[PDB]
Design a protein around this ligand. Structure first.
Ligand code: GI0
Length: 102
């Protein structure tokens, strides 16, 4: 049940218009400095893969990964960049849907 809400929220983030930067891992070969700056990469397919495996104990671990996506985004991208702007939309989406359950 704690993971049935995570399925709902992850499904809704995956299909969100602003999700396009976060659907697959950043490729550090294409992004100068990414590997140096982002210690713990995270993205939605990685969360999906881990949810399919059953690798989440509670919903808080799920939220930890979600929040990590948007912490990384705000660490690497300017708030007015195209990726930064998408990340703010996705972050506010996640925080609001999360509170709409817990
Ligand atoms: C499914 C879809 C919908 N619209 N377009 C597509 C296909 N996409 C094509 C473009 N793409 C892209 N991701 C990024 C991306 N993401 C993050 C979290 C980034 C970056 C840049 C470096 C900084 C950073 O932290 C840039 S370009 C991947 C997917």
């Amino acid at each position: 049940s704690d993971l049935t809400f995570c399925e709902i929220i992850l499904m809704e983030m995956e299909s969100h218009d602003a999700a396009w930067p976060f659907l697959e891992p950043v490729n550090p070969r294409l992004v100068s400095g990414y590997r140096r700056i982002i210690k713990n990469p995270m993205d939605f397919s990685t969360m999906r893969h881990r949810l399919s495996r059953g690798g989440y104990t509670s919903s808080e671990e799920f939220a930890a990964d979600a929040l990590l996506v948007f912490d990384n985004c705000q660490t690497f991208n300017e708030d007015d960049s195209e990726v930064g702007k998408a990340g703010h939309i996705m972050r506010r989406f996640f925080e609001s849907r999360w509170e709409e359950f817990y």
